[PDB]
Design a protein around this ligand. Sequence first.
Ligand SMILES: CCCCCCO[C@@H]1O[C@H](CO)[C@@H](O)[C@H](O)[C@H]1O
Lengths: 441, 48
Amino acid sequence: ATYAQALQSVPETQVSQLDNGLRVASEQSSQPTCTVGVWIDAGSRYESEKNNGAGYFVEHLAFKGTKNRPGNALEKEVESMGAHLNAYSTREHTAYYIKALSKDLPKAVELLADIVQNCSLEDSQIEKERDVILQELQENDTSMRDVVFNYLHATAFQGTPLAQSVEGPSENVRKLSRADLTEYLSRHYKAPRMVLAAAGGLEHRQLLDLAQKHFSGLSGTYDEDAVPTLSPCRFTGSQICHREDGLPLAHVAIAVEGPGWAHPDNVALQVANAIIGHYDCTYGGGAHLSSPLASIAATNKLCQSFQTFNICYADTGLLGAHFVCDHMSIDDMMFVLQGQWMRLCTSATESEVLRGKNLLRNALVSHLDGTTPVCEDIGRSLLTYGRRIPLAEWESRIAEVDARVVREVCSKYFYDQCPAVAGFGPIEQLPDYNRIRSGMF
Amino acid sequence: AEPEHDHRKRMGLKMLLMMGLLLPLVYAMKRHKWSVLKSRKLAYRPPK
Ligand SMILES: CCCCCCO[C@@H]1O[C@H](CO)[C@@H](O)[C@H](O)[C@H]1O
């Protein structure tokens, strides 16, 4: 078949909803294994300065025992059936998911229901996790990449909830109480804020009945005065430079404000980012890479690596790049990078945009490879778009992009716009903000 | 002794009008650029 007919053969994702508001979505395949999980509209963007880190603390407690399965009982059950239980928290979403044999879907759904509704939160466990989290904060401090990205959010979204890290400040970790957590939970873990998603060898009808059976008790009301809604987050052209000449390589992240999840412009932006691409010293292409930034960097040894990114949030986002380089290569790297954004705004060619479109097509499909990536796409999509966008639609959106669309969309977000800049390490050579700003036009 | 008398004064008026315009504008450009430095804040976080 052609790439076109193959697109129309992907089973359509089935979506249902319970009385309490919980959405149930699934994509059936014939895999003897599956992934099922709960995606929640909860994250640090929903936290205030007082409880920032609450969600991450809960993630630490989620698998430590439930009222029905105290202590390591939940753990033993997951392990004995050979399943895998994982979780993650971001500034807007939280997810708990299980990879298991398709025949074990009923127990998998029960366990998730149990986890999301009956978490013990034993005072002694809370004290133990407190120390674990503090140690994780210390470890994260050694990850220059994680530090620079937290810094980018701190400065770009300064004064708003998006400026907050997911883990929260250490003093919050030392002071968060069970009361704080149960409070956070009663407020955010409601059925209308959750999506039960599954992908693999199972039928929607079976998942739906299991959901009715195990999630019906989940609250779908809350009230009116306590319905955590999101306010837009102001973006600020600014710079944060943490100079540390003791570190061997400098990390720099720069971005302009992105449009947010729902905007159609994200497709063209993804095409443009694909044109500039990514790179690191282990890439075999070197001097022949198609991206001018990549080949210049490789032939002139300008950096160890770089990556463009389009981080999306509800109504805003960070569109830009991150690079790692020697202290004497920062200005050159910034010069070439900004020159490439400007070239795309004013002179993107049909041939490079086609390449970008093909890169995006390949990335889209190769990403949805396996029950876990698919299940995550279902969960997240339902939370963000309110629907699963089919591949055939993505193709239509990508197809609509041409050189004209790329120049116009890039001009809209990059041209003469104030960026947010974060630097960490031996950054004496990181350009002054005025010089960076002038580089935007 | 000074046949250029009337003309220098006419030119003088134009010079004053032009400087009255350009000086405040260039000064605004100066303040604009320097604002990045004038409002910057520093923090010293040595490991302890
Ligand atoms: C830039 C183009 C924006 C509109 C693209 C819509 O694209 C359409 O979406 C439908 C529903 O998902 C699909 O069934 C259909 O095959 C697809 O072509």
